[PDB]
């Protein structure tokens, strides 16, 4: 009875055709646009099919979809506990934070204590240690968004276990690599793990609460296991979650994760061969942070690059002398490129186009620039040509 | 590519490769076709609105132009559909919309006469059942003058009669308060002119997009004649403050849902709700069982009799394939959990294109259940062995005779 949705598409085509033009135009736009932004990805069509189930009209099938997602999350991540009802990863974090209430909290950036990065582009774990032994936090939150290196969840847990703290990990940005083993997992390192289904699991907007070896071990104080306390925080997106969790166990997802992982290495190496500095000097994960030219600001780069059809994200660089709104670097993720099945040659072509656009941009201040309209049109056509040579495969 | 082909491949992909899930989702649509639902606000989203929910706009966090185009279509449709001068369509929830408007218009610690009928803000109960099943507007006024709330909220889940939004505005203006209207349960009737509109009477009106408007799980924020008027005590207009001065797949579906309600097929389905309620209210009275003289909306509240308990009534009926909700009556001698009444909504029956003859037969089966079940306790239901088998089969047979039309 998938006829329901197919003939539902037919109702839109006949009666709401205006709306259907915009729906068709976005699919084309997402496919004529080159996307190197780290956490943007196109959700797999199967997951889009489950997101429009008749389970919106809501009952034992609502528990079946829930039980299937819980089982699938536990297999993918090796979780002894799993919770799947979060409508966002932000909610998954706050729900855990609410279950665990005491002023002390250490986080990367309640009485919030903050840590950051070393002046050379790494998490200052020794600062995490010093802050933990001083303020005796309730939990320490680990997990970074723009980091280009493997987060040592084991190190964080060593620090926490000497400061009597709980370790929470947001693996939202590296979830697929953690699931496929390419990135070390925090499932047993962290007491509790949170993740987003959409970013790197190519699924719906939502959240997963997970725990491993500490799931049935007692919370520090409060005479309960981590599984209870988390579960005492009590849908279409359930169906889509289970679809995404299922595809994430397929070998096709393992390949997409290696392509994320391959493209990161060739692109970072190709930036270096053009004397553009990658801050880690290497790429682990799906992200490459490039330190931008002397007069080039990250704000100028992203605005000019989008006008040429490439979307990238400005990011702070180690030793940043500039504002947050106007940076000195940019961040690129190989996520949506893996969905485009870009070979090593294509990744080198993208670095070529990107570095060529920047060499033609004459910065005027820190958020203004000049790019000759003709050169912009020519660059925008090279980008769309690369989009055609490497299309989004599952969208075809 | 096209949205349809992406989705047809998506549906095909979720049958070769993920089949366990496909059976569960396909099982549920069958369950809803054999279950006769008399619940007030449960409905089945239209397939046209459902297909819009598989937009690739989900992948959007200018790349925001098409999301702006979808949004503007929803704003303009919402404004025309309800006759509103301001609209906001980005609410994940009806509750999210209500919370968002409350935060925008109330300062921390402000008092709201929510008339909720069941820390940052203080809430006055507002009751509203005192007038023997009517809203106690006179207490709303008394409390409003005594507590001077910044906000008064109107809109009832289980009311079976028209809410006098104008009367609340009279109360609100006398007590120097803002009026919020939650019309989630009567949205289509206000839409189609059957229930009086709150757009100009209330400063801000909110609505779910699923309960009566047959659309996605979500919320909508509205304002009418008070849109360009500044919030009392503040230097900004209601429209700017309500603008809070990213799920776009739901926003495409809201546009589709708002468009369909403008079509006359929605109007007929609204008349079918209003019509079926009158027939079923009439049959209940002629079988000597309705709070209020008649239904002026989609809800019928029935007082169970002869020590019938709303909890056992609802429990027994599900075993016979009929889904209803227990609901308090004026003069609840029993607990809140064990009511002495039953609540029925005709939204699901309009989607089954049931004739007046069929509505009476459903009441017939319903009363025939209650005339037979023998409450032994206030919760332990009894007297349903093989009689419940033929009764379930008879309900499923009415489901067969009257199918959900738009679900083919």
Residue numbers in the entry:
A (entry chain A): 10 to 67, 81 to 131, 153 to 277, 287 to 448
B (entry chain B): 8 to 68, 79 to 135, 150 to 276, 285 to 328, 330 to 448
The authors write:
To gain an insight into the substituted residues involved in substrate binding in PbzB, we set out to structurally analyze its apo‐ and substrate‐bound form. While crystals of the apo‐form diffracted to 2.8 Å, we only obtained poorly diffracting anisotropic crystals for PbzB co‐crystallized with l‐serine and mTHF. However, the residues coordinating PLG and mTHF were not visible in the PbzB structure, since they were probably too flexible in the absence of a ligand, and therefore, we modeled PbzB using Alphafold. The simulated structural model had a confidence of over 95 % and an RMSD of 0.97 and 0.84 for the crystal structures of apo‐PbzB and GlyA from E. coli, respectively. An in‐depth analysis of the active sites revealed that all residues involved in substrate binding within GlyA and PbzB are superimposable. Even Y55 and Y65 in GlyA are superimposable with T68 and H78 in PbzB, but these alterations might enlarge the binding pocket of PbzB. While Y55 and Y65 in GlyA perfectly coordinate PLG, T68 and H78 in PbzB open the space for the binding of PLS. Particularly, the substitution of Y55 by T68 may lead to a reduction of negative charges in the binding pocket and thus enable coordination of serine bound to PLP. However, the PbzB T68Y H78Y mutant did not catalyze formation of any detectable amount of serine or 2‐hydroxymethylserine, suggesting that T68 and H78 residues are crucial to maintaining the function of PbzB. Therefore, one could assume that benzobactin‐producing bacteria remodel an enzyme from the central amino acid metabolism to deliver a building block for the NRPS biosynthetic pathway.
While GlyA from E. coli, one of the best‐studied examples, catalyzes reversible conversion between serine and glycine and thereby affords mTHF as the major source of C1 unit in cells, the newly identified PbzB involved in the benzobactin biosynthesis catalyzes production of 2‐hydroxymethylserine using l‐serine, d‐serine, or glycine. PbzB has high sequence similarity with AsmD and FmoH, and contains a conserved PLP‐binding loop in which the lysine residue forms a Schiff base with PLP. PbzB, same as GlyA‐type enzymes, forms homodimers with two active sites shared between the two monomers.
